[model samples]
Target chain A: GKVVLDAVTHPSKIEEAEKLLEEYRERLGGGLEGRVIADPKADPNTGNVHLKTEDGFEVDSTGKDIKTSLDAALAALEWLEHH
Target chain B: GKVVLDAVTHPSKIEEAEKLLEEYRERLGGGLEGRVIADPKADPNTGNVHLKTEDGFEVDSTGKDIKTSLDAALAALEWLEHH
Candidate 1:
């Protein structure tokens, strides 16, 4: 999946999001075969994250399915954060 | 960032390589922000793994840099394989 961040955003928030993603990876069975693609040139234009599946489907974690997945992912992050 | 196996090759070998790569990921720091892109239509044309960095540089794991990284990654696989 591709993650395009807003250019005007702070670097720390981006870093936090990355860290959170990592935590989610570990908690979610640790073998989903996913990738993160970031574009530094996204800000001031269009900031978005594009998730492409192995079957060649483009997915935006911004959607409801992603939101559900994000909740589980966030739970993983929370576990790491507390631990 | 992309893995294209030869279409004529055995599926088991491809699966093994993928498993090996995963083993390596776990043994290492566990978070390097890399993605695996596989194309089903690669064999007989151009069978290779393309590593596209954030800077837009495409490196093939079949090359030296990738081989070195693959060695470390394989070491992780070895650990997992034995255990």
Candidate 2:
């Protein structure tokens, strides 16, 4: 029922797509640039992983934060996609 | 700009939202049913994580699979939302 971007590991293959968490996490920000994509400790890992990263301009909206500021960005996206 | 679901967490807060991977991953399947959401090793973790799991019925489209069957479910979602 939701639309998930097919972001994942086509790594080493440009023609191949990155996992949703891999490629899509970039949308948050490139702050973690140059970091190894792999962490043998945890290679298996989003903006959709979206809010997890430390990069980008701001943090995501949820929990008590929702009371602070509505998730305007997500709302904007919903308006764009589903509208 | 891409749209991230702001999926990461407001854990333990019912009013809080679950991480993108947590909440959205269910779209994958419930076969992982009753599996603890926390891995302790990876308490931190979609159809968006969508294609990764195996429960509902199928896998995603990518890699050599592209020559096979396209990710019909995802494409169907795109049509429903973006088209």
Candidate 3:
């Protein structure tokens, strides 16, 4: 739909996200798990970055700044096992 | 903070949330983990439900519906390992 940053606008951000994702994957050991889809369908007004899961569940990342948003998305995934 | 439901307005909903939270806590087993603080500081206009972790992260639940929000919070936790 709307163009959001992927490996296109920011490959490093995406790579970092993927690395963090892989780290958690090993940590999970096949327990409570799902996929982290990081294209934030950004809000024009708020610029609040959001993340999605394979199951259609969405959660707003902790920040709007690109790198922080990326980190938050990775961190947010940790929620899958905590709450 | 605000008078959101907490063992008062909806005991069953809160209990369900606590149960799900506990389930995830155990599933994590000290891996990628945190705490589930479910109050859903709601927006009066949008009625969007939000959940928080002990680490001060906020996530909007998948559904505003109480039980679904509870389930989604639990499901969202599963996102940690996968993402």
Candidate 4:
């Protein structure tokens, strides 16, 4: 399944998120496509990322100091794995 | 947040899910409560587990072998974590 990035204000952030996905492909399992979006209301500096999986899992990560939003998205891949 | 296991046909399954939760507590992060349920139509021998998080993520796992149902629930905990 593909991870589709949408509605991101900064094009570079999308690239970054894509790069991060490479590290997480193994953990994401198969047939579990994911979508990630940037929160329009959130500050660009703070960075807010919302992620949803095909199986109906959603999570939001926001922070000022780091790439927590994308981190949350990649983190979801691990969570989405089947034991 | 507490992980609530509900609607399971067998009480022992709930207990098993709860015990499995122990290994996953740390990965689950804070303020993220999870709920787990069993599909009534699914066979008892071929377990089916559905899990939903407070953040609006839902996943259903089923299998004839192993504890994949609970494993999917616990796997969701890692997915629920922030970056």
TM-score of chain B of each: 0.38, 0.19, 0.35, 0.46
Give candidate 2's error at residue B23 in angstroms. Answer: 13
Better of 1 and 4 by lDDT: 4
Best by lDDT: 4
In terms of TM-score, the best-performing candidate is 4
| Model 2 DockQ (Cα-based) | 0.03
lDDT of 3 by residue, B48-77 (tens): 235554433344544334344444444443
- Per-residue CA lDDT of model 1 for A1-83, tens digit only, reads 32222112223345544564566567655443444445455332222233323322222212112223344222222222232
DockQ values per model: 0.02, 0.03, 0.15, 0.12
Error of 1 at A48 (Å): 3.0
Q: What is the C-alpha lDDT of each candidate?
A: 0.32, 0.25, 0.40, 0.45
Work out the iRMS of candidate 1: 15.2
Candidate 3 regions with alpha-carbon error over 4 angstroms: A1-47, A50-58, A63-83, B1-10, B31-58, B64-83
- Candidate 2 vs 4: which has more DockQ: 4
Q: Residue B63 deviation, candidate 3, in Å?
A: 2.0
Give i-RMS (Å) per prediction.
15.2, 15.9, 6.3, 7.1
Cα lDDT tens digits, model 4, B1-83, are 44443324344465555555444555655543444344455445544444545544344443442255455444544544533
Residue range A3-52, candidate 2, lDDT tens digits: 22222221342232243234534654443331223223322211111122
Q: Where is model 2 chain B poorest over a 10-residue stretch in terms of lDDT?
A: B61-70
CA error at residue A62 for candidate 2, angstroms:
23
Q: What is the TM-score of each candidate against the true structure?
A: 0.26, 0.20, 0.31, 0.34
lDDT of 2 at B41: 33
- Model 3 chain B lDDT-worst window of ten: B1-10
